[PDB]
Amino acid sequence: MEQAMRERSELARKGIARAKSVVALAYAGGVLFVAENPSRSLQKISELYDRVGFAAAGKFNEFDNLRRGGIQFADTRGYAYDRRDVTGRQLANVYAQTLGTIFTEQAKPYEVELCVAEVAHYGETKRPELYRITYDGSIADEPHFVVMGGTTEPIANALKESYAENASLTDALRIAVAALRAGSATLGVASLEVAVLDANRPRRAFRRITGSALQALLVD
Amino acid sequence: MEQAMRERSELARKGIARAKSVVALAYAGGVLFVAENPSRSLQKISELYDRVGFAAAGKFNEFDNLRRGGIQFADTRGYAYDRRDVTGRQLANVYAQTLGTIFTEQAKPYEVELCVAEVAHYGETKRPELYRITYDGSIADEPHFVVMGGTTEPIANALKESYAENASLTDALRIAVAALRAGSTLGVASLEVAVLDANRPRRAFRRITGSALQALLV
Amino acid sequence: MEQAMRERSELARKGIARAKSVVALAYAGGVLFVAENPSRSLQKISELYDRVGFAAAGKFNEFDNLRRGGIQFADTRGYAYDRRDVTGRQLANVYAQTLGTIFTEQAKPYEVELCVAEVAHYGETKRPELYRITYDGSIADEPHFVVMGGTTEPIANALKESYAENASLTDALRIAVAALRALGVASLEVAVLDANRPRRAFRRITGSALQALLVD
Amino acid sequence: MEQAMRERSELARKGIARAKSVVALAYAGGVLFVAENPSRSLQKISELYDRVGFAAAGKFNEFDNLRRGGIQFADTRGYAYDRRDVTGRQLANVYAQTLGTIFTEQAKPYEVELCVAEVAHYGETKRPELYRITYDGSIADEPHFVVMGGTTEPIANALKESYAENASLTDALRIAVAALRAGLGVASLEVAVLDANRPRRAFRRITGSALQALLVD
Amino acid sequence: TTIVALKYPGGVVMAGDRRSTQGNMISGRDVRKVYITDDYTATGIAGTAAVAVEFARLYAVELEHYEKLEGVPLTFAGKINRLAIMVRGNLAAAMQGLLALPLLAGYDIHASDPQSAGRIVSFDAAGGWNIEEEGYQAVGSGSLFAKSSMKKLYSQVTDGDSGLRVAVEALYDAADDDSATGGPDLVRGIFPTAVIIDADGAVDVPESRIAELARAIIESRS
Amino acid sequence: TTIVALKYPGGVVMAGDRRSTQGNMISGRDVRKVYITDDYTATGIAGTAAVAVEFARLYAVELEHYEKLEGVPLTFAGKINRLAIMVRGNLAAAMQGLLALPLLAGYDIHASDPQSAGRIVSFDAAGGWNIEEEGYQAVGSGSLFAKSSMKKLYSQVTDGDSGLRVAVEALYDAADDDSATGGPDLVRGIFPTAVIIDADGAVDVPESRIAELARAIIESRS
Amino acid sequence: TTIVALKYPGGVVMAGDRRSTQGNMISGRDVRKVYITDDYTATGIAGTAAVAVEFARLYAVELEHYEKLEGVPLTFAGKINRLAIMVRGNLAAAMQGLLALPLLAGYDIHASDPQSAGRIVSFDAAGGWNIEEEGYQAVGSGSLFAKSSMKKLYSQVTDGDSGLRVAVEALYDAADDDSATGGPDLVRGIFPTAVIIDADGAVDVPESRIAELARAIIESRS
Amino acid sequence: TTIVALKYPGGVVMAGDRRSTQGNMISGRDVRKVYITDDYTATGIAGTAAVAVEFARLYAVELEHYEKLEGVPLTFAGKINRLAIMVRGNLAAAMQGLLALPLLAGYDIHASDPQSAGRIVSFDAAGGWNIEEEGYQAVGSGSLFAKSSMKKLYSQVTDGDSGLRVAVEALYDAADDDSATGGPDLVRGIFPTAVIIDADGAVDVPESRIAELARAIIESRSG
Ligand SMILES: COC[C@H](NC(=O)[C@H](CC(=O)n1cccc1)NC(=O)CCc1ccccc1)C(=O)NCc1cccc2ccccc12
């Protein structure tokens, strides 16, 4: 069973290293998600709940199952209690429990790695929260940014020298695309998936930046 | 059978030894929990029942499962009978039975080590109880302190030399961070602290964070 | 199969040998349970029913499961029929049955050894009964004493030589601790099935009283 | 798969060989059960139904389960139909079926060897029947005696030479203990008879002073 | 139906009538309502015949089952409790008309006093039970006439024979005032059935003995 | 049926009558409706006898069961809660006629004041309960007469002896106004049963003390 | 039964009477109908006592269960939704006679303005809820008399103390017109119970204060 | 109760009264019966309050659930179908006294002509639906008074402002003939609530605007 656990861990690790990278970073306006994504309709970054967003790297069907299950959890909880009782830490916690179970009991572990981000409710003063859940269910919250998928250390190094708190949307996006560019082995609008949790939106904070708007923000 | 149970205990032991350490000690006012924890929001220390607290080392999702089940058990027993029928011994026993089953029958044993602590009810005179439940369901009675996670022997030895009964909150906290340093430099931002305070009228668990915690470390 | 069961039997035998020892003796007043138990709140000796007591050696969570299961059996049987129909022999029988199933079918066998003891009902004259049940469901009816846990041969030898029938409480207690050393309050857990009590015979002897009976 | 089966067969045969021995033989008054048994409260010989008795060798908890299951079957059938529809043959057959199932499908085979015996109902002239059921569910129809557990060959050898039909109770008991010796006293024996002369329940234990009076004198 | 049970020095007697009815129609006259349920216990049941006979049969099976499984018979309290649980189990069916009320008579071998080892237990439809301290009891449509007859006659019980006589006479007074209870049939020679229990066990009373006590009663009241 | 229970300094006392009825008919004279359920607890139950006894037995085993499993007895509040749950469990059966209301009397070893350690708990058919601050309580068809009697007699309760007198007198008034409640039978020598509970536990009050109290009242009312 | 709740600057108050009835008969004089369920929440319940006490107990358990599982207490909206789900859950049993209606009083620590953070929530038998914007509310058989009384007395509410007074006077008017609501008993010294909740949490009002306020009202009406 | 909804050029409006009743007794005066259920749909419900709010809440959750799971909101026909399925689901309990009838008002962004993209859907207790091609609809105990009022006043609808006014006026006629429907309370300042939906989305109309139209109608009948 040390055999089985090692082999499963390595299957998951190699599965994520082979996958495109995703970056999530806190900025003055909330949380920013940038991912390497050629597709027009298949999406690695998603809304979970009012002030809670989701990002994933790895095998699409697997992290999509987790995204849908996460939405089911958030919607059921918000109905059972109140929308304001649904929190980032809760979704990060359920994912840690779920992926722990999957990693230990499914035929094959999930080759996925997750980020749950939460911004404050409209009119409140609360620092963004970012959570990183790994394939075996390990969970860690990071204060500034999270990187997932592919070769992480070049991207994380680029950010840890490049990152400044309270950046502009243009500044945070530019540093983010630079850090992603350090780890790729050819990017632009057609090659990116971008979305933000906007702490200024009144209720639903998740909003996408596509096409002309994205191009205007990348030229800075 | 022999080889496989050996393999389970080795997997669990190694998982715990890779994990940051947590210490729980009895002091003049009740029970003190100090854990090495950089996180701003994820908990290794928690309330179980009125006079009962929980601390853990190992895989978060697993000791979190056990924490929730403990709360589930306690709230159910208190409802079926009465709040004063919930005891620390009962929760420690249910954890022993649970980890025994998990260790022998689940796909993977839980990489966890648990501590259940109980202080007296308000106005009553009872000395705190500490229980260690390990990954295989073994349970142990401790009167003074418990160490879990990471490199245990340096921490346990530092406490064996520096520990005194009925110390004040500040002194016990100082001892705890010292012993924690000996093993796996430690401020508020890297520590999680809470007490079972026997002087609270009903719910004894209480957190000491931020301004209060720094105020105690000086 | 034959190899797998030999391995299970060995896992049980080794696990039980690593644990602390427990002794049970018939004496003039009923049955005496003496166990090495440092714990203040975890107990190796327990009451099962009015005149039936339970003692165990080995892994705590496992023989505690068997203890709770026995109390459950005894109480439902007394309710379903009558209190007087609950007997030691029948509890020993369900323990043999249960440990047999555990030993053959559970993920891991139980690293435990059990003693069920029964004294006579108030005003009746019956020699106490002692039953040993081992990890595989083997049951043996023993007339004078039972030893369980750890290295049993020294303790059983000490009693075999030193055992006296119809001993006094102090007499049987001192023979028992003597054999156990082959040990103060803090290190001992002691209780009796006291055939002189009117219904519930189980009596714990703790602290001051126990100390009083050891020092003489 | 056949490796698993020989392993089970040898585990059961070894377990039964290490256990104590039991003999049941038909005599003028019915059937006599005598078993080597030191215990004072644990039993290897039992009543199943009005004219049917049970004896077993091997591991106690296992043949005790089988004994209760037989008692359940007999009582259930007797209630569902009528008492006189319960027969030794039928109990022997269900034991064969049960033990075959155990031997192929349970975690560990049962280390048991079984004897189901039946005498005639009161006032009828039927000759007693003995049935042997082995750990794999094999069933054998026996007319004179059954020996089970431990080293069977010497006791059965003593019986083959010493057994006579229609012996007296004292005589049959003495042949029985004599055959057992090849392989003692009240404290070491358990005896009971299926007594064809009792009107309803033929099973009857012979204990203590009565037994001792009946051994030699 | 009337079933009587009474204590005498060192034993108990139980006797029951033989009449089976469907409304006003007599559908049986040789019916047995008193059964030996074990070596020291007898049960008589009143009510629906299907349910009464089912009770007696299943109860006897239950007691012998326990005895063979556990090597020793149930204590008398256990016997009362299982019969009580059985009645309460039948309560729902009894509400829709399938009622069966038992009366239990036994000799307790594990009792302290050998001549106070007699036991008489009556029940209610819910399985309520009563161990009767006062020497006699009855059940059935004639039970009140029988109990009032025994209230005057019980001082005459000095041995098994007098107890048996009082028993038969209470059955006579029962059938005398209750048409559902059958009196002695002298044309057909059918008489109440009776069971006696002492330290030697429970035995059926021979038909001829009850016949001559009945003839004694009839003769004596004409 | 009448069951009374009252607090006295340092203890509690509970007493009950001996009558069993089926409508107007007396089906018993010696029944016991007050039971020691625990070393510091007694229960008296009114209503259908079968359920009243089943409640008593099952409750007593439930308490001992918890005690043997967890090595310590239930808090007094826990005992209240388990009994209440038992009543509510029976409500459906009670609405069909199998109703039984208990009255609980205990001594709380975990109370601060050794003279406020007596506890009297009354219940309703839904399991609602009341811990009685005002010193006495009763249940049964005579409970209203008994409570109004205790309303006038309670001021003279200073110890267990006087408390037991007030109890027997309250049962006497209840039997005086309620034909379903049985008074002292001086020809048969049958008297109410009582349980007294103090710091030393729950003990049955012997017959002789209750009889002399009875004759004391019977004398005083002539 | 009558329970009142009213908002004052910076807080809220809730009060309940002490009377228990079975039809027209008084079955209790000291019952408690208002409970601290949470550090900033109190609940009063009207209806069947068994169901009401179970509600308050079970609800407090659900709130603290959530808080220990998730490290933060429920938002006030969540608390309301859970109480409503509990009521609606009982709707069938209520239709059969086990009816219990709650009234919820709280202080919302997450409200924007700390002086207007007081909250009053009423429910109906299907679990309908309404958060009251008009300052006061009531429940129980006297709720109409209390609501009409507070309609005239509410203008005098300027702080916690005056609010507690109009609450007690509303319970006085309720008891004055409704026999199921018990007024202040000056012979036994039993007065309504009240809870105050403000920014510093939920505290039980001392009985002596309520006794004072009761006597002020009684005097003022003589 | 009365809830009205009507189309105007380029949008739709929904308004509902504030009264809560139990028999003849007024148990509420400020109750909200008209809800924003999604960025381009509003729902008003009539009947038993517990069930009515349960429906609105669950229905909004169901729509948003679909949208987050599938990256696109439901088609308007799909929304109609889900409300229908919800109502028929409740028909058994509704038969026993737990009735809730909804009215749906929305703006269909996938409509052919944005001029006529407004939608008004009424339902019955079996979950039957009607997409209204005559401009207005109402539900509740005052719905026939309101519909008969709008039959005479609907010709005056030329923009969002006149349409809102006419809606409040039909709610006024309903409250005038139906005691379970609450009219404008000029002492407490409680007025019907209304939601307006156009291409810019669905917004709740500011209470001041309802107070102005209410007093406007009251004087319109005092002179
Ligand atoms: C008092 O109640 C009248 C009762 N009669 C019945 O139950 C008779 C018995 C009868 O007539 N039998 C005819 C041949 C088979 C029996 N049966 C019935 O009355 C039918 C009951 C029924 C009606 C409608 C739907 C379902 C069931 C009775 O006589 N009972 C007396 C009685 C008591 C104990 C053992 C008995 C054994 C045999 C016969 C009678 C017995």
Ligand SMILES: COC[C@H](NC(=O)[C@H](CC(=O)n1cccc1)NC(=O)CCc1ccccc1)C(=O)NCc1cccc2ccccc12
């Ligand atoms: C219902 O209030 C009257 C009640 N009478 C009954 O319950 C009597 C008791 C009786 O007569 N017995 C005779 C032998 C066994 C009991 N029982 C019945 O009346 C049975 C009612 C019933 C009929 C059909 C279906 C279900 C139930 C009563 O006396 N209750 C008093 C009482 C209280 C506590 C313990 C008791 C124990 C024994 C006897 C009485 C006891």
Ligand SMILES: COC[C@H](NC(=O)[C@H](CC(=O)n1cccc1)NC(=O)CCc1ccccc1)C(=O)NCc1cccc2ccccc12
């Ligand atoms: C309005 O209705 C009257 C109601 N009364 C009851 O419910 C009374 C209270 C009572 O008499 N008790 C006796 C000791 C224990 C309670 N009980 C009953 O009315 C019995 C209900 C019932 C009857 C038959 C079948 C099923 C259920 C009442 O007083 N309600 C007020 C009330 C509210 C909150 C908590 C309370 C706690 C205790 C007592 C009352 C309480």
Ligand SMILES: COC[C@H](NC(=O)[C@H](CC(=O)n1cccc1)NC(=O)CCc1ccccc1)C(=O)NCc1cccc2ccccc12
């Ligand atoms: C139409 O019929 C009258 C109906 N009234 C009720 O349903 C009232 C509302 C009420 O008085 N409340 C008290 C505060 C919270 C609710 N409730 C009831 O009438 C309870 C129904 C019931 C009776 C018996 C058993 C079970 C249930 C009503 O006014 N309905 C209007 C209405 C429509 C949409 C949303 C609403 C939201 C809140 C309040 C009312 C609402």
